[PDB]
Structures are given as C-alpha cells and as structure tokens.
Amino acid sequence: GLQNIRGRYHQWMNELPERVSHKTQHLDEKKELGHLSAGARRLILGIIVTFSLILALICVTQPFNPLAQFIFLMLLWGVALIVRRMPGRF
Amino acid sequence: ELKTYEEQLQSSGLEPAAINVSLNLPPDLYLMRSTGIDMDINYRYTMPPV
C-alpha cells in the first residue's frame, strides 16, 4: 500500500495530462453551449467581478489578533501548497 | 481621578508599601481583538546606592 501510494501517485500524475486533455475537450464542450444574453452575461461575469472584489477587500483590510493572523496565514499557505500541485494555467 | 486622596500614590518608609489604584470599567471592552491597553507609568523613586 505505501509502495502502491508511490506508483498510484505517478498513475494520477499520468492521469493529469489525460484528465487535462478531457478537460480541454470539456472546455470546448461547455463553450459548445457557453452563450445566452450578452448584456446580462456582462452583468453576471461583472457580478462575479464585484462580489469577489468585495471579498478580496475584506480579506486585505481585516484587522486580526496575532493568533487569528497566524491561523489565517497557515490556511492561506495550505491552500497555496494544494493549488501549486495542480497542473495547468488555471 | 482614580485616587480619592492625594497620598495614595506615595509611600515612604524602610519597606515601601504596595501602591494600589482601583478602577471599575463598563462591561463593554470585548475580547477576541486584544487591541491593547498601554498603561503608561512615569514613576520616580529613591535610587539604590549599588
């Protein structure tokens, strides 16, 4: 099992390109439907822009005590380490 | 203002007694932030020889 972990890690590593290739097919597949109401679409992608910028502004401005700041740091660092292992431009 | 008499903040003797200043605060200074209460103390005393 422990030895299997190594081989399966490589198995998933090999799957990364395979799954990525499937994702690109799906990228086009979702685009093969990605259309609706342009004025509204601009509102909705623009709606993403405003809510996410508000959340980012709260994350930037929030005062924390040393313990809450340490917990927040460790969680953001954990997220960065997970995301760094993911392949691709995203 | 937290004295109630002038000689509260001074003690003279061979062994100086503890200087105690009492205060009661409104129950509104909530925790979980720890902003800090910098109790500045500018004190003066007799300097020991050695």
Swiss-Prot record, chain A:
Q: Which domain of life is it from?
A: Bacteria
Induction, per UniProt: Part of the yhjR-bcsQABZC operon. Expressed at low levels in mid-log phase, expression increases as cells enter stationary phase, the increase in stationary phase is dependent on rpoS. Expression is higher at 28 than 37 degrees Celsius (at protein level).
Q: Which residues cross the membrane?
A: 44-64, 66-86
Instruction: Provide the phenotype resulting from gene inactivation.
Output: When disrupted in a cellulose-synthesizing strain (a strain K12 / W3110 derivative called AR3110 with a restored, functional bcsQ gene), cellulose is no longer made and the rdar morphotype is lost.
Its localization reads: Cell inner membrane
Task: Reproduce the free-text note on domains from the UniProt record.
Answer: There are two conserved domains in the globular part of the protein: the N-terminal domain (domain A) contains the conserved DXD motif and is possibly involved in catalysis and substrate binding. The C-terminal domain (domain B) contains the QXXRW motif and is present only in processive glycosyl transferases. It could be involved in the processivity function of the enzyme, possibly required for holding the growing glycan chain in the active site.
Function as written in the Swiss-Prot or TrEMBL entry: Catalytic subunit of cellulose synthase. It polymerizes uridine 5'-diphosphate glucose to cellulose, which is produced as an extracellular component for mechanical and chemical protection at the onset of the stationary phase, when the cells exhibit multicellular behavior (rdar morphotype). Coexpression of cellulose and thin aggregative fimbriae (curli fimbrae or fibers) leads to a hydrophobic network with tightly packed cells embedded in a highly inert matrix that confers cohesion, elasticity and tissue-like properties to colonies.
What family is this? Belongs to the glycosyltransferase 2 family.
Miscellaneous section: The genes bscA, bcsB, bcsZ and bcsC are constitutively transcribed but cellulose synthesis occurs only when DgcC, a putative transmembrane protein regulated by CsgD, is expressed. Cellulose production is abolished in E.coli K12 / MG1655 and W3110 due to a premature stop codon in bcsQ.
UniProt name for this protein:
Cellulose synthase catalytic subunit [UDP-forming]
> Whose protein is this, by species?
Escherichia coli (strain K12)
Q: Which gene encodes it?
A: bcsA
Give from-to of the shown chain within the full protein. Answer: 108 to 197 of 872
UniProtKB/Swiss-Prot annotation, chain B:
Q: To which protein family does this belong?
A: Belongs to the AcsB/BcsB family.
Whole-protein coverage range:
374 to 423 of 779
Q: What is the documented function of this protein?
A: Binds the cellulose synthase activator, bis-(3'-5') cyclic diguanylic acid (c-di-GMP).
Subunit text: Tightly associated with the cellulose synthase catalytic subunit.
Q: Where is this protein found?
A: Cell inner membrane
Extra facts: The genes bscA, bcsB, bcsZ and bcsC are constitutively transcribed but cellulose synthesis occurs only when DgcC, a putative transmembrane protein regulated by CsgD, is expressed. Cellulose production is abolished in E.coli K12.
Gene symbol here is bcsB
Tell me the superkingdom of the source. Answer: Bacteria
For this entry, the protein name equals Cyclic di-GMP-binding protein
